Amino acid sequence: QIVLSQSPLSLPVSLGDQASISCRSSQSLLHSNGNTYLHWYLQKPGQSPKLLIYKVSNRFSGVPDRFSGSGSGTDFTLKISRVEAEDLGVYFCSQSTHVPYTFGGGTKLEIKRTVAAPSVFIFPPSDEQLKSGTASVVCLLNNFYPREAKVQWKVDNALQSGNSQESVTEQDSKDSTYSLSSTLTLSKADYEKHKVYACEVTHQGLSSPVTKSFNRGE
Amino acid sequence: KKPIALICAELYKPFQDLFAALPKDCSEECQTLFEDIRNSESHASAWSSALRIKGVAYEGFFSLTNSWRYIPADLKPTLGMAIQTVFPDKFEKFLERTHLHPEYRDFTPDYLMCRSAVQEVSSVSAVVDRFKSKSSEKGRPIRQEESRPKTESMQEDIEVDELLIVEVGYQTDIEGKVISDIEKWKGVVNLMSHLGIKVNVLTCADNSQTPRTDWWIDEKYVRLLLNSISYLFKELLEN
Amino acid sequence: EVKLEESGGGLVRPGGSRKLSCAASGFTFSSYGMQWVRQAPEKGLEWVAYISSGSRTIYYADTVKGRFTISRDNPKNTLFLQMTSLRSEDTAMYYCATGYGGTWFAYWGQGTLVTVSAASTKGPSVFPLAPSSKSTSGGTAALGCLVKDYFPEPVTVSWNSGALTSGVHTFPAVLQSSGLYSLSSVVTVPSSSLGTQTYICNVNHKPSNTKVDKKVEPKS
Ligand SMILES: [Mn+2]
C-alpha cells in the first residue's frame, strides 16, 4: 500500500503569509496511463472534506487561487500563497493511482497570533453530583495561545494520576486561541477526606506555573 | 466393413449441412479436409484430417456465435504483431524484455482483438462478463487473467488501448485445456504488467458430452457438429 | 448542484449489521464511479470502498474485506454500503464521495455517524459549574455545565436557548472507559450580570429523546 508521509504535522502561519505542505509517497504515483493521481483536501473543523487540488496541480472548480500544487513521482507540495482565516483546518493528501486508495495523516494548519496566557478557573463539584456519590472537579484554561500547556492535579499537595481527563477545543476562528478543560473525578468518599484541591498550569505566557486551588469546605 | 470413401458418402448430407453454415473461408478449409478423408489411403491419415476438421469447424461456429471474424490459422496475428501495431511506442521495450523468452513474440492465440491485423471489439469487459456469467451459471470451466501494473486502479478520466486474447477448443479434457492455456499466457500477462499494457486472456473448451444447450457455440451449431464430424469419428473406428 | 445525502447511521451492537444509503442528485449518477470514506472521531480519513459505474469493478480496503458490500441502484440514483460483523473499530463518520469524472473525492456528503458498541442508550446527567471568585478574572466570570455519562454521541449544548453564544466553549466529548461520553460547556460573561441575568444551559440528546435545561447560579 502507498504510504503518504506529510510534513510538517502542524503548521503555524501568520495571516497573509505563505504556507507549504509536503507529501511524500512511498512509491511513484505515476500511473501507467500517464496521469499522476495525487490530490489535496482541506477539512475544516466540523465539516466534511473538500477537494482542493486533483492530479498534482489542477485546482478544483471554484477553489480560490491562493491554493496550488506541484511535484512529480514521489514528491509533491501544496502551497497557500497568502493564508486567510478560513484556511484553518486539516490538510490531507491522497492518492488513487493504486488500490487501496490512501491518505496522508493530515497537516493541521494553525493561525499564528500573539502569545496569550490562559485564564485559569476552578470549579468544585456541585451538590447535585455529590448527592449521587461522585465528585468531579473542573479546571478551565481559557483563551490561550500557543497550544502547548501542562496541567496537573494535586490533592493536599499529592500529585494525582489515573483519575483526570482533558479536552481541548479547536483553534477559535475569531480570536485564534485555545481553551482546555481538565476534569478530576473522585469518589464522594475520597473527596470528603481531603481539603485542598489544586490545579497547576504551566504555559509560556505565564511568568511561572500557576496553582489555582480551593478548600473543600469553603 | 465400410471403406473410408463409402463412410464419406453416407454422411454426405450432414456434412453438406455443416459446410453451408460455417463461415466461407472456414467452410472451404473443412471441404478440402473432407476430400482428404474421402481419398485417405490409411486410417491414420483419415484420423488426423478428421481431427483438424473438428477443430476448424468448431472455431468457425465460435466466431459465428460471438459475431467475431473467423481467421484462418495462416492469417492469425502473433503477439509481437499486436504489440507492434497496437502499442507502437512500447514495441522496442517489448523486444528487450522478451530477449530471454523470444517465443512470446510468436504466441498466436485463436482470437487476438483490441478495443475499437488485430481485430476490433466494442467492449472487452462485456466479452469477459459473458464468459464469466456462463461459467458461473452452467459450471463451465474457464480461465481468465488480466494484466495489472503493481496494484494500479482503473481510472475514469482517460481511456487506454487494451487487448483481448482468447483461446477456444473442442476436446474431451476440458479442464486440462483451460489450465494449460492460462499457464502458457501467464508469463506474457506478467510481462504486459511490467510494460503498462492492459490485456485480458480468456480460455474455454467444449466436448461432445457437454449438454447441447450449455456450449460456447449456439445449440443449432452443436447439432451440426454432432451430426457430422462426431458421427464421422464413430464411423472411422467401427470400420 | 451535485449533492450526496447519506442515511442509515446509528447505534449497532458489535457483531451486528447495518446498511448505509446515499441518495445522489444533480448529475448523471449512472455514469460515474462511487466511493465510501470514513473518519473515526479525532482521527484521519480512511478509504472504504469503490464501485464502478456499471458495478463490474469493486475495490475494498483490506480492513473491511469479507464484511462490507458496496452496491448501487443506478435507476434509483442510490449507492449502498452493507456492513456486517461490525467491530468497535468501525465506529466512524461514513461519507459517500464521487469524483464526477475521476477516482479523486471531488464531491462529498455530510456523512452519517455509525457507532458500534454494546453500551446502552442513556441521556446525560447535567451538573452546574457555578461561578465564584475561583472563576472570576477582572470583570469576567466563567460558568458552565458538566454533561456526564451519555451514549451515543450527538449531544447539542446551547446557552439560553441559543441567545448566548459569545465566549461559549463546548468541549469535545471524551469516550470513557465506562463506554459512555462526557463533556463540559463553559461561557464567560460579565461578573456584573451574575444575579441579574439568568444562565440556563440547554442539553439536547436526540438518541435518548432527552432534553435538559439546567439553570447555573452563583452558590451561597
Ligand atoms: Mn484452439
XYZ file of C-alpha atoms and ligand atoms in Angstrom:
678
model
C 0.000 0.000 0.000
C 1.187 3.506 -0.799
C 2.205 5.274 2.395
C 1.867 9.056 2.137
C 4.061 10.972 4.587
C 3.034 14.565 5.314
C 5.278 17.165 6.881
C 5.071 19.184 8.984
C 2.485 17.529 11.252
C 1.316 21.046 12.112
C 1.871 24.450 10.522
C 1.603 27.723 12.438
C 1.437 30.608 9.979
C 0.569 34.320 10.189
C -2.367 35.736 8.263
C -1.107 36.925 4.895
C 1.960 34.684 4.808
C 2.587 31.730 2.535
C 2.470 28.102 3.611
C 3.940 24.931 2.134
C 2.918 21.379 2.952
C 4.923 18.399 1.768
C 3.538 14.985 0.798
C 5.999 12.125 0.286
C 4.910 8.907 -1.408
C 6.470 5.517 -0.608
C 6.244 4.613 -4.325
C 5.807 6.558 -7.522
C 2.241 7.723 -8.158
C 2.793 7.969 -11.918
C 0.103 5.694 -13.371
C 0.833 3.616 -16.471
C -1.769 5.681 -18.360
C 0.396 8.811 -17.935
C -1.545 10.583 -15.176
C -0.436 11.002 -11.542
C -3.309 10.581 -9.083
C -2.214 12.734 -6.152
C -4.841 15.095 -4.699
C -5.201 17.542 -1.806
C -8.098 18.119 0.599
C -8.990 20.660 3.251
C -11.206 19.557 6.140
C -12.482 22.495 8.166
C -13.494 21.765 11.786
C -16.967 20.230 11.959
C -17.351 19.837 8.176
C -16.772 17.194 5.566
C -13.572 17.245 3.470
C -13.347 19.487 0.399
C -11.198 18.766 -2.631
C -8.559 21.429 -3.353
C -6.179 20.034 -5.988
C -6.529 16.948 -8.170
C -3.825 15.212 -10.216
C -0.970 17.137 -8.649
C -1.765 20.652 -9.845
C -5.335 21.028 -11.153
C -7.345 23.349 -8.936
C -10.862 22.012 -8.451
C -13.508 24.267 -9.956
C -14.457 27.065 -7.575
C -11.362 26.660 -5.373
C -9.686 30.001 -4.571
C -6.495 30.524 -6.482
C -4.266 31.013 -3.450
C -4.081 27.172 -3.478
C -1.738 25.349 -5.812
C 0.117 22.070 -6.009
C 3.228 20.788 -7.747
C 5.501 17.751 -7.866
C 6.153 14.500 -9.654
C 6.836 10.848 -8.844
C 7.026 10.585 -5.038
C 7.452 14.277 -4.037
C 4.581 16.783 -4.003
C 3.760 20.141 -2.446
C 0.685 22.184 -1.611
C 1.193 25.955 -1.301
C -1.145 28.547 0.105
C 0.284 31.736 -1.355
C -1.436 34.022 1.168
C -3.084 32.435 4.210
C -6.573 33.575 5.225
C -8.553 32.958 8.414
C -10.894 30.465 6.690
C -7.899 28.251 5.829
C -7.828 26.987 9.425
C -8.152 23.201 9.446
C -6.519 19.911 8.449
C -4.956 19.317 5.015
C -4.795 15.759 3.637
C -3.051 14.416 0.595
C -4.403 11.266 -1.038
C -3.537 9.045 -3.988
C -5.745 6.969 -6.260
C -3.092 5.551 -8.573
C -3.003 2.255 -6.660
C -5.538 0.220 -4.676
C -6.036 0.748 -1.729
C -6.518 4.479 -2.199
C -4.674 6.049 0.719
C -4.436 9.326 2.675
C -1.625 11.075 4.448
C -2.109 11.570 8.174
C -3.011 15.241 7.806
C -1.253 18.552 8.477
C -3.055 20.887 10.849
C -2.789 24.500 9.714
C -2.676 26.773 12.766
C -3.150 30.549 12.588
C -0.295 32.321 14.353
C -1.221 35.021 16.882
C 0.368 36.817 19.794
C 1.105 34.755 22.860
C -1.915 34.720 25.179
C -1.679 33.288 28.663
C -4.601 31.199 29.940
C -7.115 32.400 32.448
C -7.226 29.536 34.972
C -10.552 28.756 36.606
C -11.532 26.003 39.022
C -14.990 24.650 39.867
C -15.733 22.450 42.905
C -18.199 19.594 42.380
C -21.813 20.662 42.561
C -24.020 19.454 45.366
C -26.298 17.653 42.908
C -23.437 15.443 41.734
C -22.090 14.892 45.240
C -25.578 13.667 46.216
C -25.141 10.956 43.558
C -21.878 9.593 45.009
C -19.206 11.172 42.801
C -17.173 14.398 42.753
C -15.927 15.951 39.517
C -13.581 18.947 39.849
C -13.165 21.051 36.715
C -10.133 23.197 35.917
C -10.507 25.548 32.953
C -7.729 27.107 30.849
C -9.495 29.770 28.785
C -8.406 31.579 25.620
C -4.695 30.803 25.481
C -2.077 30.624 22.701
C 0.040 28.698 21.660
C -1.456 25.299 22.409
C 1.384 23.736 24.460
C 0.260 23.610 28.069
C 0.788 21.325 31.051
C -1.996 20.731 33.591
C -1.634 18.528 36.696
C -3.860 17.862 39.708
C -2.717 17.990 43.330
C -4.946 16.970 46.229
C -3.427 18.039 49.566
C -0.153 18.503 47.650
C -0.104 14.863 46.469
C 0.068 14.606 42.667
C -2.903 12.852 41.031
C -2.652 10.363 38.218
C -5.166 7.983 36.702
C -8.272 9.982 37.644
C -8.365 13.013 35.326
C -9.142 13.518 31.657
C -8.591 16.540 29.435
C -10.193 18.028 26.340
C -9.117 20.888 24.105
C -11.176 22.984 21.718
C -10.155 23.558 18.150
C -8.496 26.882 17.406
C -11.107 29.629 17.710
C -11.944 31.087 14.313
C -12.350 34.627 15.650
C -9.519 35.137 18.181
C -7.287 32.142 17.301
C -6.964 30.911 20.894
C -7.433 27.527 22.535
C -9.427 26.527 25.601
C -8.731 23.454 27.716
C -10.641 21.595 30.409
C -9.269 19.005 32.830
C -11.735 17.061 34.989
C -10.681 15.327 38.202
C -13.142 12.628 39.286
C -13.057 11.198 42.802
C -15.480 9.086 44.723
C -17.528 11.189 47.101
C -15.810 9.361 49.974
C -12.330 10.140 48.636
C -13.376 13.753 48.107
C -14.541 14.294 51.669
C -11.223 13.060 53.164
C -9.110 15.909 51.701
C -9.073 19.693 51.957
C -7.016 21.406 49.208
C -7.949 20.803 45.568
C -5.373 22.361 43.251
C -4.866 22.785 39.527
C -1.310 23.576 38.433
C -0.877 25.141 34.997
C 2.338 25.738 33.046
C 2.259 27.869 29.916
C 4.901 30.055 28.302
C 2.649 33.111 28.601
C 2.906 32.862 32.382
C 5.935 34.097 34.299
C 5.716 30.933 36.408
C 3.357 27.972 36.930
C 0.004 28.973 38.384
C -1.640 26.850 41.048
C -5.368 27.577 41.341
C -6.894 25.826 44.314
C -9.782 25.812 46.752
C -10.506 24.400 50.202
C -13.295 21.812 50.200
C -15.448 23.232 52.973
C -15.077 26.778 51.611
C -16.539 -53.413 -43.379
C -17.208 -49.941 -44.887
C -14.362 -48.251 -46.838
C -13.473 -44.708 -45.770
C -14.815 -43.313 -49.039
C -18.194 -45.002 -48.510
C -18.248 -43.557 -44.989
C -17.998 -40.082 -46.538
C -20.857 -40.738 -48.939
C -23.345 -41.840 -46.226
C -22.552 -38.627 -44.288
C -22.908 -36.547 -47.428
C -25.941 -34.620 -46.153
C -24.776 -33.999 -42.541
C -21.540 -32.650 -43.985
C -23.415 -30.556 -46.542
C -25.452 -29.017 -43.727
C -22.129 -28.391 -41.945
C -20.390 -26.644 -44.865
C -23.430 -24.451 -45.522
C -23.488 -22.953 -42.022
C -19.758 -22.349 -41.449
C -18.169 -19.019 -42.439
C -16.919 -19.056 -46.017
C -13.165 -19.485 -45.515
C -13.799 -21.949 -42.699
C -16.264 -23.870 -44.905
C -13.702 -24.207 -47.708
C -10.959 -25.434 -45.389
C -13.235 -28.129 -43.968
C -14.314 -29.050 -47.504
C -10.700 -29.534 -48.626
C -10.098 -31.613 -45.488
C -13.218 -33.695 -46.141
C -11.961 -34.717 -49.584
C -8.646 -35.617 -47.939
C -10.596 -38.027 -45.724
C -12.525 -39.404 -48.703
C -9.235 -40.001 -50.557
C -7.409 -41.150 -47.404
C -5.405 -44.307 -48.086
C -4.789 -45.058 -44.389
C -6.845 -44.857 -41.200
C -4.085 -42.758 -39.631
C -4.244 -40.173 -42.431
C -8.036 -40.040 -42.240
C -7.975 -39.626 -38.449
C -5.609 -36.599 -38.453
C -7.756 -34.970 -41.148
C -10.901 -35.592 -39.127
C -9.294 -34.059 -36.033
C -8.339 -30.924 -37.948
C -11.921 -30.661 -39.234
C -13.219 -30.950 -35.668
C -11.100 -28.007 -34.551
C -11.593 -25.833 -37.640
C -15.370 -26.214 -37.803
C -15.775 -25.607 -34.048
C -13.795 -22.373 -34.297
C -15.900 -21.216 -37.241
C -19.007 -21.779 -35.120
C -17.413 -19.987 -32.171
C -16.837 -16.976 -34.451
C -20.486 -17.082 -35.591
C -21.873 -17.351 -32.040
C -19.886 -14.294 -30.916
C -20.110 -12.366 -34.223
C -16.325 -12.323 -34.349
C -14.378 -12.786 -37.585
C -13.141 -16.307 -38.335
C -9.441 -16.022 -39.088
C -7.637 -18.938 -40.802
C -4.584 -20.068 -38.846
C -2.248 -18.764 -41.556
C -3.559 -15.206 -41.147
C -3.758 -15.064 -37.343
C -1.684 -12.221 -35.848
C 1.042 -13.020 -33.333
C 1.575 -11.263 -30.019
C 4.544 -9.326 -31.404
C 2.373 -8.152 -34.293
C -0.329 -6.923 -31.929
C 2.226 -5.075 -29.807
C 3.897 -3.589 -32.886
C 0.722 -2.224 -34.449
C -1.471 -1.542 -31.400
C 1.158 -0.245 -28.925
C 3.964 1.008 -31.203
C 5.622 3.252 -28.590
C 6.283 0.196 -26.409
C 7.404 -2.295 -29.079
C 11.107 -1.667 -28.514
C 10.745 -2.275 -24.772
C 8.568 -5.287 -25.628
C 11.528 -6.699 -27.573
C 14.098 -6.127 -24.809
C 12.016 -7.871 -22.150
C 11.413 -10.880 -24.452
C 15.127 -11.474 -25.031
C 15.179 -14.429 -22.600
C 11.774 -15.629 -23.839
C 11.597 -14.786 -27.561
C 8.895 -17.386 -28.242
C 6.497 -14.924 -26.564
C 6.596 -12.743 -29.693
C 5.340 -15.698 -31.729
C 2.414 -16.672 -29.490
C -0.633 -16.887 -31.754
C -3.995 -17.137 -29.968
C -7.200 -18.241 -31.596
C -8.563 -14.679 -31.281
C -6.421 -11.582 -30.844
C -8.514 -8.436 -30.509
C -8.222 -4.867 -29.256
C -10.695 -2.250 -28.104
C -12.124 -0.372 -31.077
C -4.322 -7.479 -38.466
C -5.714 -7.339 -34.910
C -9.498 -7.470 -34.904
C -11.548 -4.884 -33.020
C -14.245 -5.355 -30.401
C -16.660 -2.839 -28.907
C -16.032 -3.776 -25.270
C -13.538 -6.222 -23.813
C -15.258 -6.104 -20.413
C -18.541 -7.253 -21.997
C -16.831 -10.310 -23.516
C -15.201 -11.164 -20.190
C -18.528 -10.685 -18.383
C -20.429 -13.083 -20.628
C -17.720 -15.734 -20.285
C -17.766 -15.213 -16.512
C -21.581 -15.359 -16.470
C -21.942 -18.692 -18.317
C -19.042 -20.191 -16.363
C -20.929 -19.250 -13.180
C -24.407 -20.170 -14.472
C -23.628 -23.542 -16.102
C -20.430 -24.524 -14.260
C -18.341 -24.356 -17.463
C -14.552 -24.351 -16.764
C -12.813 -21.135 -17.859
C -9.553 -19.423 -17.001
C -9.160 -15.671 -17.061
C -6.252 -13.357 -16.292
C -5.819 -9.586 -16.572
C -2.507 -7.748 -16.633
C -2.112 -5.245 -13.836
C 0.896 -2.973 -13.204
C 1.692 -3.075 -9.465
C -1.700 -2.572 -7.736
C -2.964 0.121 -10.131
C -6.604 1.138 -10.014
C -8.834 1.557 -13.027
C -9.425 5.198 -13.930
C -12.346 7.251 -15.207
C -10.691 10.347 -16.698
C -8.744 8.813 -19.606
C -9.009 5.824 -21.945
C -6.228 3.367 -22.785
C -5.840 0.818 -25.516
C -6.231 -2.795 -24.497
C -6.045 -6.320 -25.864
C -8.286 -9.350 -25.532
C -6.583 -12.699 -26.155
C -8.968 -15.672 -26.481
C -8.308 -19.417 -26.729
C -11.034 -21.903 -27.615
C -11.179 -25.614 -28.302
C -13.238 -28.766 -28.861
C -11.532 -31.597 -26.950
C -12.583 -34.108 -24.347
C -10.267 -32.952 -21.493
C -11.838 -29.524 -20.924
C -10.176 -28.717 -17.580
C -6.794 -29.734 -18.998
C -7.214 -27.345 -21.931
C -8.021 -24.206 -19.975
C -5.346 -24.970 -17.343
C -2.563 -25.410 -19.894
C -3.692 -22.338 -21.881
C -3.617 -19.965 -18.931
C -0.220 -21.335 -17.900
C 1.158 -20.580 -21.360
C -0.089 -16.974 -21.224
C 0.823 -16.244 -17.589
C 4.366 -15.142 -18.387
C 3.044 -12.911 -21.165
C 0.421 -11.344 -18.875
C 3.118 -10.681 -16.251
C 5.268 -9.173 -19.000
C 2.394 -6.893 -20.024
C 2.012 -5.719 -16.416
C 5.610 -4.535 -16.426
C 5.107 -2.709 -19.747
C 1.910 -0.953 -18.618
C -0.147 -2.677 -21.355
C -3.647 -3.843 -20.422
C -4.500 -7.309 -21.727
C -7.109 -9.940 -20.902
C -6.670 -13.657 -21.596
C -9.738 -15.929 -21.808
C -9.752 -19.666 -22.392
C -12.591 -22.189 -22.545
C -13.493 -25.508 -24.147
C -16.402 -27.786 -25.060
C -16.545 -31.538 -25.546
C -19.274 -33.707 -27.034
C -20.583 -34.717 -23.577
C -21.452 -31.102 -22.787
C -25.270 -30.733 -22.784
C -26.274 -29.203 -26.130
C -27.713 -26.038 -24.520
C -24.570 -25.313 -22.486
C -21.828 -24.999 -25.139
C -19.916 -21.874 -26.060
C -21.486 -22.182 -29.528
C -25.155 -21.878 -30.419
C -27.137 -25.091 -29.993
C -28.018 -25.183 -33.705
C -24.261 -25.383 -34.382
C -23.887 -28.112 -31.741
C -26.269 -30.322 -33.725
C -24.344 -29.642 -36.932
C -21.066 -30.840 -35.361
C -22.665 -33.793 -33.562
C -24.463 -34.908 -36.749
C -21.345 -34.658 -38.939
C -17.803 -34.528 -37.554
C -18.657 -36.560 -34.459
C -20.513 -39.298 -36.382
C -17.577 -39.487 -38.776
C -15.292 -40.217 -35.832
C -17.638 -43.013 -34.767
C -17.698 -44.489 -38.292
C -13.902 -44.360 -38.619
C -13.446 -46.549 -35.533
C -16.220 -49.122 -36.069
C -14.658 -49.764 -39.524
C -25.947 21.293 -7.774
C -24.245 17.942 -7.139
C -25.471 16.582 -3.816
C -24.844 13.348 -1.911
C -27.124 12.599 1.061
C -26.221 9.668 3.307
C -28.615 7.980 5.678
C -28.656 4.743 7.653
C -26.371 5.614 10.563
C -26.948 4.899 14.217
C -26.066 2.576 17.039
C -25.178 -1.099 16.397
C -24.059 -3.949 18.648
C -20.637 -5.451 17.953
C -21.043 -8.335 15.555
C -24.185 -6.593 14.241
C -25.144 -5.305 10.791
C -26.154 -2.050 9.156
C -26.931 -0.694 5.689
C -25.943 2.805 4.643
C -27.562 4.541 1.694
C -26.521 7.568 -0.333
C -29.022 9.485 -2.478
C -27.360 11.297 -5.369
C -28.753 14.236 -7.324
C -27.561 16.870 -9.761
C -25.588 14.721 -12.220
C -25.987 11.535 -14.214
C -25.240 9.133 -11.329
C -25.114 6.015 -13.530
C -22.105 7.302 -15.487
C -19.710 7.599 -12.562
C -17.894 5.507 -10.006
C -18.948 5.963 -6.379
C -16.979 5.612 -3.123
C -17.338 5.315 0.647
C -14.897 7.016 3.038
C -14.916 7.043 6.835
C -13.393 9.049 9.681
C -13.107 7.725 13.218
C -13.591 10.516 15.797
C -10.486 12.709 16.208
C -8.634 10.649 13.528
C -7.796 10.990 9.818
C -9.601 9.873 6.669
C -9.714 6.227 5.611
C -10.962 4.980 2.263
C -13.536 2.167 2.420
C -14.804 1.027 -0.988
C -15.166 1.958 -4.658
C -17.651 0.728 -7.260
C -17.541 1.457 -10.972
C -20.488 2.992 -12.831
C -21.673 -0.384 -14.149
C -20.681 -2.310 -10.972
C -18.155 -4.513 -12.795
C -15.201 -3.307 -10.715
C -15.277 -3.175 -6.924
C -12.404 -2.390 -4.578
C -12.247 -2.700 -0.774
C -9.917 -1.582 1.971
C -8.214 -4.638 3.431
C -9.817 -3.866 6.840
C -13.437 -4.262 5.555
C -12.932 -7.161 3.088
C -15.313 -10.027 3.769
C -17.582 -7.866 5.957
C -18.724 -4.906 3.790
C -20.523 -4.978 0.433
C -20.749 -1.902 -1.779
C -23.537 -1.796 -4.369
C -25.743 0.611 -6.236
C -29.106 1.007 -7.948
C -28.500 3.263 -10.937
C -32.178 3.816 -11.892
C -32.742 4.891 -8.288
C -29.646 7.149 -8.015
C -28.658 5.329 -4.806
C -25.331 3.981 -3.546
C -25.300 1.388 -0.725
C -22.872 0.046 1.866
C -23.929 -3.183 3.596
C -21.935 -3.522 6.810
C -21.735 -6.847 8.683
C -19.704 -8.326 11.582
C -19.015 -4.800 12.757
C -16.412 -4.008 15.401
C -15.778 -1.066 17.708
C -13.022 -0.029 15.277
C -15.733 0.526 12.651
C -17.160 3.427 14.661
C -16.796 6.378 12.336
C -18.467 9.057 10.283
C -19.211 7.466 6.886
C -19.148 9.654 3.749
C -20.099 8.789 0.203
C -17.986 10.568 -2.389
C -17.525 10.712 -6.146
C -15.002 12.254 -8.491
C -17.618 13.147 -11.102
C -15.049 12.166 -13.737
C -12.151 10.562 -11.865
C -11.178 8.489 -8.847
C -10.497 11.522 -6.611
C -13.017 12.618 -3.957
C -14.493 15.692 -5.607
C -17.970 15.655 -4.035
C -18.747 14.515 -0.503
C -21.903 14.069 1.534
C -22.423 15.382 5.026
C -21.865 11.851 6.328
C -23.684 9.557 8.704
C -22.381 8.503 12.125
C -22.152 4.769 12.803
C -21.476 3.748 16.415
C -20.556 0.122 17.149
C -20.915 -0.533 20.885
C -22.717 -2.674 23.440
C -23.310 0.378 25.629
C -26.958 1.168 26.160
C -28.543 4.453 25.128
C -28.557 6.858 28.030
C -29.305 10.555 28.429
C -26.891 12.812 30.308
C -26.724 13.930 33.897
C -26.229 17.699 33.808
C -24.456 19.413 36.689
C -23.779 23.153 37.026
C -20.309 24.659 37.115
C -21.165 27.562 39.402
C -19.462 30.968 39.039
C -17.442 32.089 42.037
C -14.346 34.035 42.994
C -12.343 30.944 41.935
C -13.701 31.587 38.382
C -13.567 35.393 38.120
C -10.844 37.331 36.296
C -11.281 41.103 36.256
C -14.855 41.927 35.317
C -15.361 38.460 33.806
C -16.907 35.314 35.301
C -16.772 31.801 33.881
C -19.603 29.341 34.438
C -20.677 26.169 32.713
C -22.364 22.770 32.672
C -20.977 19.280 33.159
C -22.742 16.902 30.754
C -21.897 13.486 32.188
C -22.417 9.869 31.050
C -24.464 9.862 27.840
C -24.473 7.491 24.882
C -24.214 7.520 21.961
C -22.660 10.733 20.618
C -24.556 13.662 19.314
C -25.309 15.860 22.247
C -26.003 19.522 21.441
C -25.402 22.196 24.078
C -26.589 25.783 23.876
C -26.940 28.643 26.345
C -30.208 30.500 26.993
C -31.871 28.731 24.049
C -29.056 29.927 21.749
C -29.162 33.614 22.711
C -25.790 33.388 24.462
C -23.046 32.479 22.002
C -20.192 34.881 22.749
C -17.488 33.238 24.843
C -19.065 29.765 24.653
C -16.665 26.808 24.584
C -18.342 23.423 24.315
C -15.591 20.862 24.660
C -15.248 17.688 22.580
C -16.605 14.603 24.308
C -14.301 12.070 25.901
C -15.140 8.414 25.497
C -14.825 6.988 28.999
C -13.671 3.511 29.987
C -17.282 3.013 31.109
C -18.178 3.232 27.384
C -20.148 6.470 27.959
C -19.283 10.046 26.970
C -18.800 13.250 28.906
C -18.100 16.850 28.024
C -18.406 20.263 29.564
C -19.563 23.610 28.183
C -18.355 26.898 29.579
C -19.090 30.548 28.942
C -17.537 33.756 30.204
C -19.933 36.601 30.990
C -19.594 39.938 32.788
C -19.417 39.355 36.524
C -21.785 42.334 36.870
C -24.611 40.233 35.365
C -24.488 37.439 37.952
C -27.683 37.546 39.968
C -29.368 39.789 37.398
C -29.079 37.612 34.261
C -30.266 34.029 34.320
C -27.984 31.439 32.733
C -29.502 28.166 31.518
C -27.631 25.504 29.578
C -29.881 23.559 27.216
C -28.735 19.991 26.652
C -30.399 18.068 23.825
C -29.595 14.380 23.352
C -31.753 13.179 20.471
C -30.721 9.460 20.666
C -32.419 9.144 24.072
C -35.075 11.798 23.373
C -33.660 13.672 26.375
C -33.717 17.451 26.683
C -32.316 19.009 29.841
C -32.417 22.669 30.913
C -30.137 23.470 33.831
C -30.005 26.858 35.498
C -26.493 27.780 36.641
C -26.329 30.072 39.653
C -23.696 31.566 41.955
C -23.671 29.452 45.165
C -24.264 30.678 48.788
Mn -7.907 -23.632 -30.057
